[PDB]
Paper text:
[name] was successfully crystallised from sodium/potassium phosphate in two crystal forms, one orthorhombic, P 21 21 21 (a∼64 Å, b∼66 Å, c∼78 Å) and the other monoclinic, P 21 (a∼50 Å, b∼56 Å, c∼52 Å, β∼116°), each with one protein molecule in the asymmetric unit. Monoclinic KAI2c diffracted to 2.11 Å.
Author numbering: 3 to 268
Amino acid sequence: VVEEAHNVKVIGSGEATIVLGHGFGTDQSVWKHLVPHLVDDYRVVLYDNMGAGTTNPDYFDFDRYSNLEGYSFDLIAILEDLKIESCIFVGHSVSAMIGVLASLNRPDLFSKIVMISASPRYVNDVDYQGGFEQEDLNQLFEAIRSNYKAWCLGFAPLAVGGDMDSIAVQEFSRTLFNMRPDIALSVGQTIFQSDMRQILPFVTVPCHILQSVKDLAVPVVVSEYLHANLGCESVVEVIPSDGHLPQLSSPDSVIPVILRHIRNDI
């Protein structure tokens, strides 16, 4: 039931397990360039977030997913269903915070978290640069509500970065448009208005903080904030790449960095 609902894939065998969680607007396909490099050394677990366009909209519980905790409960549920005692969790964008939240409730289930395009807060305040002013998010939400198709086409090149006519830009606008308009809007508001800064000192699981040097949703200062405030042992690596989904758009420069962080401990 959980396997089906979240399009769970298990590739490989053995104790050494790796779980990949995707960000907003995409699905497990964001991991296509990474997965080939993991299958020989790990049992690889892929799953889709409830609300992804690949999931049944009838299962999207608005109250359950009003806080990022709903997604954390789902992750723990997938780990328990698969009888996973321990894993390396790689979290892209929102999944990095979902992984961190899951590690608070279940530190036993994670030996390390590798974050990609992570942020605990997108909204700026006079002493915190998250990358977005509330007035701009208000305009972003109204554009999602006004015409979802036109928003997807406009937003995908900006979020992916690089050339506007690339395969990755085309892939992302398709996965964004796969979302049901009302779920996409509700999830967008939930993530963009989230605040995970207060939970950072309480993390015990080692964190590897990776991001593109140019990321529409993640200023470089966010990786330093996470590194300074996470209570766990952490390491930062700012990649010379452009884009929020760099594992998909710039694999040649991003995949080697991710592998180093998965393969080597702090």
